[PDB]
From a paper:
The versatile nucleotide excision repair (NER) pathway initiates as the XPC–RAD23B–CETN2 complex first recognizes DNA lesions from the genomic DNA and recruits the general transcription factor complex, TFIIH, for subsequent lesion verification. Here, we present a cryo-EM structure of an NER initiation complex containing Rad4–Rad23-Rad33 (yeast homologue of XPC–RAD23B–CETN2) and 7-subunit coreTFIIH assembled on a carcinogen-DNA adduct lesion at 3.9–9.2 Å resolution. The coreTFIIH contains two helicase-family ATPase subunits: XPB(Ssl2) and XPD(Rad3) in human(yeast), and 5 nonenzymatic subunits: p62(Tfb1), p52(Tfb2), p44(Ssl1), p34(Tfb4), and p8(Tfb5). Altogether, our study illustrates how the Rad4–Rad23–Rad33 (XPC–RAD23B–CETN2) complex recruits TFIIH to damaged DNA in 3D structural models and provides the groundwork to visualize how the NER initiation is carried out in multiple, coordinated yet distinct steps.
In previous structures of TFIIH, the “open” form of Tfb5-Tfb2C (p52-p8 in humans) was stabilized by hydrophobic interactions between the N-terminal helix of Tfb5 (residues 14–26) and the adjacent hydrophobic helix (residues 563–571) of the Ssl2 C-terminal helicase domain (C-Ssl2, residues 549–776). In the TFIIH/Rad4–23–33/DNA complex, Tfb5-Tfb2C were rotated ~60° and stabilized in an alternative position (“closed” form). Compared with the previous structures of TFIIH, this Ssl2-Tfb5-Tfb2 made little contact with the rest of TFIIH, which allowed C-Ssl2 to move away from the rest of TFIIH by ~11 Å. The repositioning of Ssl2 relative to the rest of TFIIH is also consistent with the movement observed after multibody refinement of Map 1 that revealed a ~30° rotation of Ssl2-Tfb5-Tfb2C relative to the rest of TFIIH. Altogether, the current structures suggest that the rotation of Tfb5-Tfb2C and thereby unlocking Ssl2-Tfb5-Tfb2C from the rest of TFIIH may be key in stimulating the translocase activity of TFIIH (Ssl2) in an NER-specific manner.
Residue numbers in the entry:
A (entry chain 7): 423 to 766
B (entry chain 6): 107 to 457
C (entry chain 1): 168 to 355, 368 to 393, 465 to 519, 537 to 567, 573 to 639
D (entry chain 2): 7 to 286, 328 to 507
E (entry chain 0): 557 to 754
F (entry chain 4): 22 to 94, 113 to 323
């Protein structure tokens, strides 16, 4: 995505995986590696071990790191002792990380110099005008009947599927088409996501979207205005290219327990060089009101207000029922879709 | 420690009628970050304020608005005497964003074309709110300046944070040489007062020019309500005025009759003029220890006079700023108010 | 550039302005297509609009930046027709004849849209702007290379055409060495000098394309003292303060006041036949502009025959409106006809007064 | 607000005239009527003859006749006047006692009661015993709200609070806690608080030996102006004197010591009707002593402080450590959820913040204000006057804890044709009184203003 | 780089080239552009012909620069030999003479940007070594160069010059403080210094 | 919504005698004074304790009455203080009367009165930034003869008008005297959104006052009570003296001149005109 756009020529930066065998101990120039290959249980081959031996052999004067917090600092300290380098670098993503142990990776590498002040970045023009909202999808009888039925975690897709959520999504789609804006949707579901995509009848990103198809939809979404809504699932995120954020919609709110919300906020919200809309970065959390995840939607709201981004709630949708394709609008069809999701 | 004008030395003549053609500046420069929103937004806001003010104090003049985008001068309000049109035009502009480079030459030529119909007794003017540090001319400029001064068209410009040689030449040129009209600003408040002082008519020392009697007539309000009918906009309007001579209805205005084309006014416009012609002598600040006058106000009744011997406090001053001809005191608030809003000096009225 | 007769005869300009406003074209045709006014005087009223429009039109943009920029500030959009495509290319053409000539020569074949501009990138944007490409992509071929060769000596001859005998304050030439015949030293590597000459030449070409210019007293005091006493004489019985005294007087005061309240209240600060309303509005606009032309002319003055034609037309219009009122009374009845008469009373009175005034003036001139 | 005016009109007509016998009371209630009625009454007072209604309609132009209805309905409700279907017309005129008492008051009348004041050496200092009255008011406020130690000995006052159910506190256990009444006490700043207390004293002190005429005479004479000399000495009924002693106990009377003297006119009685400045061992800084902080970030910014005041603030926000200028507290959804546990509506707090804690938010409310009302038509975007972001957050919290939506009015019917229903709906949209409507059912539950105006148009 | 594109977007560029004729032509176009609207930049050489005689009045010069400090020994040892003669014949060391010459040319360049006292104009320099030479400069330049204006960064430089340009733009014409620094017609000199005959 | 009603009662003992001369001497200004006191009390009661102020205009100057500039250095009883203080001041003023007072009859300081009162309103409004005062002044004049229309005060009156409109201060006027519609005052009330009342002499105004001089504080939904039309056919020609309709106004002078141009040097500013322009005017 960048290093060839960057000046880097990958001819020297051999990529090692313990599965992707590459040129070690012969690279004339700099190398690009990964924590999994450098020191992890995922040493599927001795290519990683040979890379580490070469790393010990050459006094690597500098090290570039990206998102070391996920990987435990134990392997970092082990390779720090093993390689005996001259200097390092930490390109952190979170203020507080699990690798803040007694031996801090700061003094292992160096002091702080700059902080990723997202209020400074997402407002100067990169992702300027970040507005957040949590639309409360109206409750229906079937959803609360299911709530009373069970208290397990299966209710996630059960309150996710609300057809009124799709109605609000379609209104957002048509509004942003009218404004010529771009829409990103976070929907890790499969069956309900495909049902909504069929209902809207437009080209769409979905769960495990093909990479070529995903790139085509991204082109037709950020460039073409006939299609402007993409549904990003949980398959991509940290494995795909982050598209410009102008209008973000979130549906699922589990994302493990924590720090996944922060990572998603940092990544999904990417630079958007558009200023036509007064709020050039919409955040939406379509939440079925009076459901299990009301508590976690409030948790998301508190998280966001901690993040400092502008937040609101728009449940007084203008022309909420005036949108086209009022399929499954009735609570009877809401219950039928609930029966469908109970299979999921 | 005082900041006062020493004396007014043209209290004999002004241009009472006017036709001022304000020209804004909507070009890429105006998008820098020195004034709170930008240059541009603050500029247009103050422009609205100035439009209201100017059409108040000079309620018999006209005005036209001109922008400078993409090196072009695109008229955004015909020269007209109704403030609301210009106000709306500026409203519309403020939501639109600048581009291109300021083509001072084109704007100048468009103005000179625009002010041709203005008759001899009416006086012309332009007010360039120049914001950038360059121009982009499709022709000789000194040609235009020469044409201007040939057409007796005074020009005043309000540069932003710099001084441009050509603009200085421009102001020095049209205004009969006497250079005082290229005032540039150093603060927002300075900018507000800049527009404010742009509001008044403009004397320097007028050459002896033609002075001409102008025909005009006053209207009389109408009575009927259901008979709503208009001859200046062709609508139904519940009641208006009558040209004394053309004898046709005209929606409320100091406008020109749209039938027989003679100026219409009531008088209060003439009253504003009178206020501008012959102002008062600047009120003097009485000596601190030599006053020995009444301990109150005169127009008002304020208790802010002195303190009688207080080391440094009494050594400061004696708030007794007192006008000359009536030789009566007035507290600072009263003097500020008299010299700003109402110009009949209280005591000097009474004798 | 703008003259009264010029705008009068600018027929194409006038028709363009007709296209400008629906209201304008409407009023004009109904003043014309209704066997009404010759367009000449119709514009003679509207001249300032014409002048404004004309000036808003013929407004050549500057050369300068965009002209330059068209070589510097324009290095990214390798796609289709970029920003200000026609505008940028015309800026190029006025800026550089060679590209215009090459594009024209490469119209019948070799499209200059995509492939023309692609090869142009290499050829020109190496020729102008940055350093001598020399090696690398030498796509400067065919027309490109030909025009390169041309432009070389062309810029040469231009530069030749630029040399003034500069006034002897600045004359560095006569200043340097052309006083003496001396023997110095010099010690301060080809190419790029051409770059410097390029920027000089561009700037000077720009500037030159701009120099181109293309009882009293006694009893007074008595009564005063009397009152002063009365005051001082205790008195001031606010109880005795009238209250209203005569209930009748009170009543009368109330009567006066309610009368005035009623009259001033009568000031309530909606026609029936919307189609007839619009038609009458058209009639009013018509009669208004007609009278406008008279009250111009009848004041001003030797074009008496023009005034005569205007007066005859105005009398015709008055009779026309009389028939209009007759038809309105016939069809719409009375109440609607009454409303129409009310709506048209002011204009009707004005035109009638104008007719009477003309009759008086005509009698005065004749008798 | 119980809107004592409603209590005023509650009492019957004969006792109303009984009260109107006291000119000072007439004037004091003249102070209360809506301005329209004020002007109309002042008109009628002098011309000694009834007046037809038609004139009093034509006096008022459109866009405001709703105030005409307000005034006439109010005045008729309290029966200050007597409508007279004399000739089938409407011969308006006031209760003649009202007219004579008022006119006497304007021009040197015989209201010895209003003139009960005595002028003498008023050695009472401004701070002098004013601080004592302020301290008593603070003491009772803290005791009712419940302080760490509530020295409030108002046995009569405590009985009034309990039997009146002033606050949701277990007086049986001695609890003085915030109920709906307690929440209102937390809400009504001064005029509201003093008024609720006066009404409570009225309700409790209403059984025997009342002399309600003398009661209101005494109350308003307290509120009228500084009686000073001989007030407690002479200008009081026997039961009037007892009520005066009780009120002085309640703070609202700043009677001096010695138990026998002229009336001690504390500032509080002035505060009863003034609707003005609210400021009261010997230390009292002259400044907006109220201290708090409320801004877009939903946090407390307190540099100034006042103990019972900051406790009031805490009544809907957490406390961890009181500081020198600050107290540890951050206003969040849970902070107001604390009061939502008491079920207190997020309504009084709105205007409270807009008004109270402004002694520490003067500049905040000014920068929010920005005079963005004359500038509102020009610049269409208001500059966060009365911050609506926090308002939206508060409304969101209220709905989250609320889950129920209610509307005021009454069900309406007999909309026989769609034309009348549509015209009434358009009129209501013009006046903004229609909560919701539908021509299919010809029914809604809204205020009565549209029906009132249509009925008035039809009948007259 | 793209650096020249921006200055193109604002002002005009007029380089200095060895042939004198083209140089004169460029210089006069520079003047013609300055007195016209578009701002124009002329970049030349301190040792070069331009600094020698050409004058830069009010309009024609506002902000000279001195990219680096002019030194010669880039080239060969004729300066070395002359400097040898200098040291042996005069009690002058190498770097002393070199700095002296450099500041000579620097002052000659700088002085061009003023003509009267009504004129004005920034006179920046740019190099680390300049800071210690502050005394080598001519006096009247040194006076205006206060201590606090040393080794400023570019950013504070832009700030200060912005404030300057604004302030000078003001018509600060008390005309009574100008009786101090103008010695008006026939009198203030007469009075003042005929009394100063002391 | 508190209001600052600042009455401006002019008392010319010349005009007072005229009032005695008018009709019969069946009562001096005393009637007006008492009615004014009562009306002032009425307003003082109506609102939530909103201040007042009163100014006079005697033959040789003006002087405040109610606000009672520093001198030492019943019923609500504040009514008492206001009224007794006013009457003490007015009796003091009546002591200020003699032949030297009879001398300077040349002018009539009403314009000074209005101007100073407006200044007072500004003072009070400015000091009381909190609780903005919807103020509005009044005017009471004893309409006398001997001058059909004094005009040397024409301009300051209009300057008062413009100040009033900017300050948003309706100014109501009550003329008591002969049937001579005070044209300048009439335009003043009409333009500044006021009310004009040309009563007869001897009726106890109090009804007129409390009716039509009490609806201007901060209401304005209510039809004002102004007399017949307020024609704005303004000042007569400076040269002629006949009211003009199709005016002819010179120039920088601004004077309004009749159809009779003197041909040169409009007779208020020495400005000779283009005889070509004169002929152009004469082209009719
Ligand atoms: Zn109209
Ligand atoms: Zn006319
Ligand atoms: Zn004063
Ligand atoms: Zn004076």
């Amino acid at each position: 995505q960048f290093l060839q756009w960057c000046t880097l020529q990958p001819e020297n930066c051999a990529v090692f995986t313990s599965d992707n065998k590459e040129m070690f101990q012969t690279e004339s120039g700099l190398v690009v590696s990964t924590y999994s290959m450098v020191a992890n249980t995922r040493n599927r081959s001795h290519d990683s071990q040979k890379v580490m031996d070469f790393l010990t052999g050459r006094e690597w004067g500098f090290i570039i790191l990206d998102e070391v917090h996920v990987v435990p600092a134990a392997m970092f300290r082990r390779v720090v002792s093993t390689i005996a380098a001259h200097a390092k670098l930490g390109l952190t993503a979170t203020l507080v990380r699990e690798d803040d142990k007694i031996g801090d990776l700061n003094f292992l590498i160096g002091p702080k110099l700059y902080e990723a002040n997202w209020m400074e970045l997402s407002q100067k023009g990169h992702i300027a005008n970040v507005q957040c909202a949590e639309v409360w999808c109206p409750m229906t009888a079937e959803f609360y009947q299911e709530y009373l039925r069970e208290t397990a975690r299966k209710r996630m897709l059960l309150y996710i599927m609300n057809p009124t959520k799709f109605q609000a999504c379609q209104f957002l789609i048509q509004y942003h088409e009218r404004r010529g804006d771009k829409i990103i949707v976070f929907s890790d579901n499969v069956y309900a996501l495909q049902e909504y995509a069929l209902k809207m009848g437009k080209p769409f990103i979905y769960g495990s979207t093909p990479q070529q198809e995903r790139m085509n939809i991204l082109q037709n979404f950020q460039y073409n205005d006939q299609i402007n809504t993409i549904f990003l699932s949980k398959v991509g995120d940290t494995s795909i290219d982050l598209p410009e954020a102008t209008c973000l919609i979130q549906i699922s709110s589990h994302y493990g327990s924590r720090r996944q919300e922060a990572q998603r906020l940092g990544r999904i919200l990417r630079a958007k060089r558009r200023n036509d809309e007064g709020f050039n970065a919409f955040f939406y959390s379509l939440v079925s009101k009076d459901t299990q995840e009301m508590y976690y939607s409030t948790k998301r709201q508190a998280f966001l207000v901690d993040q400092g981004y502008a937040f609101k709630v728009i449940t007084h949708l203008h022309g909420m029922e005036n949108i086209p394709n009022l399929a499954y609008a009735s609570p009877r069809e809401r219950r039928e879709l609930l029966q469908e999701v109970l299979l999921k | 420690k005082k900041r006062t004008a020493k004396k007014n030395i043209t209290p004999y003549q002004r241009g009472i009628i006017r036709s001022l053609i304000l020209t804004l500046d909507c070009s890429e420069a105006m998008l820098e970050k020195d004034l709170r929103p930008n240059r541009h937004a603050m500029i247009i806001q103050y422009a609205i304020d100035f439009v209201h003010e100017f059409f108040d104090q000079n309620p018999i003049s006209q005005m036209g608005i001109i922008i400078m985008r993409n090196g072009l001068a695109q008229l955004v309000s015909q020269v007209s005497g109704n403030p609301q049109d210009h106000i709306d035009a500026l409203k519309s502009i403020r939501k639109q964003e600048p581009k291109g480079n300021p083509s001072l030459q084109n704007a100048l030529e468009m103005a000179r074309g625009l002010l041709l119909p203005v008759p001899a007794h009416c006086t012309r003017e332009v007010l360039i709110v120049f914001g950038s540090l360059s121009t982009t001319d499709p022709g000789d400029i000194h040609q235009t300046i020469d044409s201007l001064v040939s057409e007796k068209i005074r020009v005043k410009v309000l540069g932003l944070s710099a001084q441009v040689a050509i603009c200085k030449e421009l102001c020095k040129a049209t205004n009969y040489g006497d250079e005082s009209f290229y005032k540039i600003l150093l603060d927002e408040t300075h900018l507000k007062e800049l527009f404010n002082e742009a509001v008044t008519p403009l004397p320097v020392n007028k050459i002896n020019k033609g002075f001409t009697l102008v025909k005009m007539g006053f209207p009389t309000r109408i009575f009927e309500d259901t008979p709503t009918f208009c001859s200046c906009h062709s609508k139904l309007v519940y009641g208006g005025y009558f040209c004394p001579n053309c004898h046709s209805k005209v929606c409320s205005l100091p406008t020109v009759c749209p039938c027989c084309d003679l100026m219409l006014i009531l008088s209060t416009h003439l009253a504003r003029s009178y206020h501008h012609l012959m102002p008062l002598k600047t009120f003097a600040e009485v000596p601190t220890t030599e006053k020995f006058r009444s301990e109150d106000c005169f127009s008002c009744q304020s208790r802010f006079p002195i303190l009688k011997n207080h080391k440094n406090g009494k050594l400061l001053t004696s708030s007794r700023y007192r006008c000359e001809d009536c030789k009566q005191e007035f507290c600072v608030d009263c003097d500020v108010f008299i010299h700003e809003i109402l110009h009949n000096c209280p005591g000097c009225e009474s004798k | 550039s703008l003259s009264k007769e010029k705008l009068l005869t600018n027929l194409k300009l006038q028709q363009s302005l007709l296209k400008g406003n629906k209201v304008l074209m409407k009023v004009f045709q109904e003043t014309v297509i209704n066997a009404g006014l010759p367009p000449s005087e119709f514009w003679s009223t509207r001249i300032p609009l014409l002048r404004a429009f004309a000036l808003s039109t013929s407004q050549k943009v500057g050369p300068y930046n965009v002209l330059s920029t068209i070589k510097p500030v324009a290095s990214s959009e390798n796609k289709v027709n970029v920003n200000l495509s026609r505008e940028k290319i015309l800026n190029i053409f006025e800026n550089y004849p060679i590209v215009k000539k090459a594009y024209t020569d490469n119209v019948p074949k070799n499209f200059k849209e995509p492939e023309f501009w692609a090869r142009f990138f290499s050829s020109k944007l190496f020729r102008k702007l940055r350093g001598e490409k020399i090696m690398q992509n030498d796509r400067g071929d065919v027309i490109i290379d030909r025009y390169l060769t041309l432009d070389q000596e062309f810029d040469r001859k231009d530069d030749d055409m630029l040399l003034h005998p500069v006034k002897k304050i600045i004359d560095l030439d006569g200043n340097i060495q052309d006083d003496p015949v001396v023997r110095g030293n010099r010690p301060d590597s080809d190419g790029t000098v051409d770059i410097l000459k390029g920027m000089n030449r561009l700037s000077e070409k720009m500037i030159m394309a701009l120099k181109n210019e293309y009882s009293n007293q006694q009893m007074l005091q008595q009564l005063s003292l009397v009152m002063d006493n009365l005051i001082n004489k205790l008195d001031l019985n606010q109880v005795v303060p009238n209250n209203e005294v005569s209930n009748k007087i009170n009543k009368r005061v109330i009567t006066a006041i309610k009368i005035n309240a009623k009259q001033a209240k009568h000031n309530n600060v909606e026609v029936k036949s919307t189609l007839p309303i619009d038609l009458l509005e058209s009639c009013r606009m018509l009669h208004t502009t007609c009278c406008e032309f008279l009250k111009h002319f009848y004041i001003h003055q030797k074009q008496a025959s023009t005034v005569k034609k205007l007066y005859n037309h105005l009398k015709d219009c008055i009779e026309k409106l009389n028939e209009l009122f007759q038809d309105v009374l016939n069809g719409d009845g009375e109440s609607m006809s009454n409303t129409c008469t009310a709506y048209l009373k002011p204009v009707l009175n004005s035109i009638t007064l104008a007719t009477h005034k003309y009759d008086e003036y005509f009698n005065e001139y004749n008798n | 607000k119980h809107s004592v005016t409603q209590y005023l009109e509650e009492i019957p007509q004969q006792v109303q005239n009984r009260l109107y016998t006291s000119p000072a009371t007439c004037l004091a209630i003249y102070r209360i009527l809506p301005p329209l009625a004020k002007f109309f009454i002042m008109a009628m007072v002098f011309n000694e003859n009834e007046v037809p209604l038609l004139d009093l309609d034509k006096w008022v132009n459109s866009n405001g006749k709703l105030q005409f209805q307000n005034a006439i309905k109010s005045m008729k409700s309290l029966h200050l006047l007597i409508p007279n279907k004399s000739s089938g017309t409407l011969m308006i005129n006031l209760n003649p006692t009202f007219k004579i008492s008022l006119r006497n008051a304007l021009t040197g009348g015989e209201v010895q009661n209003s003139f009960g004041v005595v002028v003498e050496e008023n050695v009472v200092s401004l701070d002098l015993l004013d601080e004592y009255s302020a301290n008593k008011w603070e003491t009772i406020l803290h005791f009712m709200v419940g302080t760490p130690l509530a020295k409030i000995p108002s046995e009569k006052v405590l009985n009034l609070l309990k039997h009146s159910k002033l606050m949701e506190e277990v007086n049986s256990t001695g609890e003085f806690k915030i109920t709906n009444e307690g929440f209102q006490f937390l809400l009504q700043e001064i005029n509201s608080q003093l008024w609720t207390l006066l009404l409570q004293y009225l309700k409790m002190i209403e059984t025997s030996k009342m002399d309600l005429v003398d009661v209101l005479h005494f109350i308003f004479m307290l509120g009228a102006l500084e009686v000073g000399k001989a007030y407690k000495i002479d200008a009081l009924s026997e039961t009037q004197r007892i009520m005066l002693q009780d009120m002085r106990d309640y703070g609202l009377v700043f009677q001096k010591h010695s138990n026998d003297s002229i009336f001690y006119p504390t500032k509080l009685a002035l505060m009863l009707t003034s609707d003005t400045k609210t400021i009261r061992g010997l230390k009292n800084q002259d400044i907006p002593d109220g201290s708090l902080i409320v801004e877009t970030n939903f946090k407390i910014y307190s540099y100034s402080n006042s103990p019972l005041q900051i406790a009031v603030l805490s009544l809907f926000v957490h406390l961890k450590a009181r500081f020198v200028n600050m107290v540890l507290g951050q206003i969040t959804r849970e902070s107001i959820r604390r009061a939502l546990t008491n079920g207190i509506t997020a309504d009084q707090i709105i205007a409270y913040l807009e008004t109270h804690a402004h002694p520490q938010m003067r500049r905040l409310a000014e920068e929010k204000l920005e005079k963005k009302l004359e500038l509102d038509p020009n610049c269409k975007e208001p500059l966060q006057v009365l911050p609506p972001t926090v308002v939206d957050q508060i409304r969101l919290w209220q709905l989250e804890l609320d889950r129920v939506i209610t509307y005021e009015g009454s069900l309406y019917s007999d909309f026989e044709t769609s034309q009348e229903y549509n015209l009434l709906s358009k009129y209501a949209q013009d006046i903004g009184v229609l909560l919701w409507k539908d021509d299919k059912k010809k029914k809604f539950f809204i205020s009565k203003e549209g029906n009132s105006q249509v009925l008035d148009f039809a009948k007259r | 780089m793209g650096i020249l594109d921006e200055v193109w977007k604002h002002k005009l560029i007029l380089v200095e080239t060895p042939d004198a004729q083209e140089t004169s032509l460029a210089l006069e176009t520079y003047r013609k552009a300055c007195s016209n609207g578009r701002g124009a930049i002329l970049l030349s050489v301190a040792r070069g012909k331009v600094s020698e005689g050409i004058d830069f009045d009010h309009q024609y010069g506002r902000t000279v620069l001195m990219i680096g400090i002019p030194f010669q020994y880039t080239e060969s040892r004729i300066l070395k030999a002359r400097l040898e003669f200098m040291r042996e014949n005069y009690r002058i060391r190498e770097n002393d003479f070199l700095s002296f010459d450099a500041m000579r040319h620097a002052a000659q360049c700088l002085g061009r940007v003023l003509r009267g006292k009504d004129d004005y104009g920034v006179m920046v320099l740019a190099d680390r070594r300049f800071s210690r030479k502050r005394s080598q400069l001519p006096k009247w330049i040194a006076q205006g160069l206060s201590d606090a204006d040393l080794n400023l960064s570019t950013d504070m430089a832009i700030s200060n010059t912005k404030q300057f340009l604004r302030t000078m733009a003001q018509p600060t014409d008390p005309k009574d403080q100008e009786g101090v620094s103008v010695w008006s017609y026939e009198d203030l000199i007469k009075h003042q210094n005929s009394r100063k005959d002391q | 919504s508190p209001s600052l009603l600042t009455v401006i009662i002019e008392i010319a003992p010349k005009l007072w005698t005229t009032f005695d001369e008018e009709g019969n001497e069946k009562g001096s200004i005393i009637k007006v004074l008492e009615a004014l006191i009562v009306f002032l009390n009425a307003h003082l009661a109506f609102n939530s304790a909103n201040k007042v102020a009163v100014i006079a205009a005697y033959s040789q100057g003006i002087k405040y009455l109610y606000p009672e500039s520093t001198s030492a250095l019943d019923m609500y009883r504040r009514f008492r203080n206001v009224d007794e203080t006013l009457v003490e001041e007015i009796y003091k003023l009546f002591e200020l009367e003699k032949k030297q007072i009879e001398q300077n009859s040349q002018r009539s300081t009403l314009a000074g009165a209005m101007s100073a009162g407006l200044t007072y309103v500004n003072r009070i409004s400015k000091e009381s930034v909190t609780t903005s005062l919807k103020s509005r002044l009044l005017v009471l004049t004893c309409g006398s003869g001997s001058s059909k229309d004094e005009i040397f005060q024409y301009i300051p009156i209009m300057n008062c008008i413009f100040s009033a409109t900017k300050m948003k201060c309706p100014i109501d006027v009550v003329k008591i005297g002969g049937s001579k519609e005070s044209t300048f005052l009439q335009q003043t009330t009409d333009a500044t959104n006021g009310v004009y009342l040309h009563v007869e002499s001897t009726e106890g105004l109090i009804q007129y006052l409390a009716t039509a001089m009490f609806i201007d504080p901060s209401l304005r939904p209510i039809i004002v009570k102004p007399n017949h039309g307020s024609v704005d056919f303004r000042t007569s020609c400076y040269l002629t003296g006949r009211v003009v309709a199709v005016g002819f106004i010179c120039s920088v002078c601004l004077c309004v001149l009749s159809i009779i141009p003197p041909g040169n040097k409009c007779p208020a500013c020495d400005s000779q005109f283009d005889e070509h322009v004169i002929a152009k005017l004469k082209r009719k």
